[model samples]
Structures are given as structure tokens and as C-alpha cells.
Target: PAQDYRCQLSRNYGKGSGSFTNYYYDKATSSCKTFRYRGSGGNGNRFKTLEDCEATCVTAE
Candidate 1:
């Protein structure tokens, strides 16, 4: 069976911090990809589903 792979943001930002780039695993490249976004003002959270990871980690720009 195909692997039910999951991913999450492997980086964090500080409160009041401006937008910055982060990286997470990309199955296509088998490596991390860049994601730009503003600080959440809270600790980075985990992603359970692939859709969730893509939504938060990939669409941050």
C-alpha cells in the first residue's frame, strides 16, 4: 500500500515578527520547500492531514 505520508512546518517565528520563510518536506523533491508568512504569535502547531499541512505550510505566502 502507498504510504499515508504527513508533513508539518519545521520552523517557528516570534511574536510581532515580520513575515519570513520556512521549510517543510516536499515529497516531490524529497526535500524541504520554502514558505513565507507572518508570525502566528504562538508556537508552531502540528499538521495532521496533508491538506492541513499544505494549507498552513504551503499557502502562507
Candidate 2:
């Protein structure tokens, strides 16, 4: 059988004197590592395939 589905992770902070940081994902690690700034902010986050993750500097914030 051949099948495919997309999985994504998103983040935001509700209104407050709060703060957040960029947490990048590594599918190989299956984990998110936090960065100091909004390293991954994007317009309509999407990737065609898993290989793109490393090339685009596709980060998350």
C-alpha cells in the first residue's frame, strides 16, 4: 500500500506579558529544539517533502 499524510507543529502565545522562542523540529530526532528568537516565522508553513527540512533552514518560532 502507498499512502501519505502531513503532520505539522505550530505555536503562539495568548495575550499577556509573556514570551516565546523558536523551536525547530528534526524528524530524525522527533523533537523540537528551542532557539533564542523567532527563527522559524513564515508565511503559510508548508514543505513538499521531508528532505526540504534541512535545505530551507525551515525553522519554527
Candidate 3:
């Protein structure tokens, strides 16, 4: 399957100090990686679960 544009976004940690672990698709590596989100102010590329991020962005293994 073709990868979506959302998967190509940069890792957006949002705009706060709160430590919230989130996931985003690392297009360069072709994998989902964990990121420290600020609890708010991110984009659709951020996923609460790794599975969701991979499922949505990963094209294959």
C-alpha cells in the first residue's frame, strides 16, 4: 500500500512541558517511533498508541 502524507510529517512534540509519550511515523526509517508529546497542540500525525501509528502509517513490515 502507498504511504500517506501524514506519515511523512516531522515529529511534533507540541507546546507544553507535560511529559506525554506518543507515537509518530518516522518516514526516513519507515517505522513508528515514540515521542514526548506536550499533552496538547500536535497534529494528526501523533498517535496515542504505537499500534495505531504503525497501522495507519506503515506500508508493511
The best candidate by lDDT is 3
Candidate that scores best on TM-score: 3
Q: Against the hidden reference, what TM-scores do the models get?
A: 0.29, 0.24, 0.64
Segments in model 1 whose C-alpha atoms lie over 4 Å from true places: 1-18, 38-61
Pairs in clash, predicted candidate 1:
none
RMSD vs true structure, all candidates: 10.4, 11.5, 3.0
Candidate 3 segments exceeding 4 Å error: 13-16, 40-44
- Residue pairs with backbone overlap in model 3: none
Decreasing lDDT order of the candidates: 3, 1, 2
Rate residue 54 of model 1 by lDDT.
61
Q: List clash counts for every candidate, in order.
A: 0, 1, 0
- Using alpha carbons, what is the TM-score of model 3? 0.64
Tens digits of lDDT, candidate 1, 1-61:
1123334433343233564544444545543444443455434443334455565445542
Put down candidate 2 lDDT per residue, 1-61, tens digits, no spaces: 0111222343232122332333444444543344333334432223334344333443321
What does the lDDT read for residue 30 in candidate 3? 76
